[PDB]
């Protein structure tokens, strides 16, 4: 599978966009947490289907398939969130019908810090002019880099080759190609940071009983 062909399989694996669904009502710490957990649960169902559509992911051991999805889920969600918000300065596009402002994060205690992190990282992706095909590779790399091992090292290498190929297709200088690749992978650390913070907050909100004990979202949060 050439890098173009692999990029195409990722384009085709793309999960469908989740619509939030709500009977109106304004924002309180419990209501916002409710909407976010409702969105994430539906998105996780589709994320498992997306991963399955990545060539070679089903060839990995069940242990490895479960390992990668359980470690990276919050990071994959926030990447999708960041990508949806790229053309919307100062806003977080959770769903077409759920657009949150920075100042709206003052609702839930602990959420503001995460909102700021995601907004800063989205602004960095905006600055870099992240392309849809770069987003496709970066997101799949997030899944695979949350670490048989030969099949995983191969699949991670193939997605990385595809990204390098995507950057070369822009016609930019070799020095600038290495710099863009480094600039995109340096932000992976920021995605992990926001994710670590998001997950710590989710445990906190459940400990405080702000939001109820979930189904597939709770499974991901636990093991």
């Amino acid at each position: 599978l050439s890098p173009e062909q692999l990029v195409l399989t990722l384009l085709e694996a793309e999960p469908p966009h989740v619509l939030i669904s709500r009977p109106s009502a304004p924002f309180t710490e419990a209501s916002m947490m409710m909407s976010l957990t409702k969105l994430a649960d539906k998105e996780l169902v589709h994320m498992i289907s997306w991963a399955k559509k990545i060539p070679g992911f089903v060839e990995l051991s069940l242990f490895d398939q479960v390992r990668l999805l359980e470690s990276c889920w919050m990071e994959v969600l926030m990447m999708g969130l960041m990508w949806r918000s790229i053309d919307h300065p100062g806003k977080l596009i959770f769903a077409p019908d759920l657009v949150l402002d920075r100042d709206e994060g003052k609702c839930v205690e602990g959420i503001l810090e995460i909102f700021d992190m995601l907004l800063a990282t989205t602004s960095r992706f905006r600055e870099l002019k992240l392309q849809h095909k770069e987003y496709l590779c970066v997101k799949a790399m997030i899944l695979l880099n949350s670490s048989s091992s030969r099949k995983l090292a191969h699949l991670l290498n193939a997605v990385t080759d595809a990204l390098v190929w995507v950057i070369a297709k822009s016609g930019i200088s070799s020095q600038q190609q290495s710099m863009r690749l480094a600039n995109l992978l340096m932000l992976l650390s920021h995605v992990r940071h926001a994710s670590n913070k998001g997950m710590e907050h989710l445990l906190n909100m459940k400990c405080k009983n702000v939001v109820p004990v979930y189904d597939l979202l709770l499974e991901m949060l636990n093991a």
Binding site: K52, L62, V66, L69, E219
Partner: peptide, 11 residues
Amino acid sequence: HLILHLLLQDS
């Protein structure tokens, strides 16, 4: 749990 049903059970 549910992830080992979705990952095992095909579509």
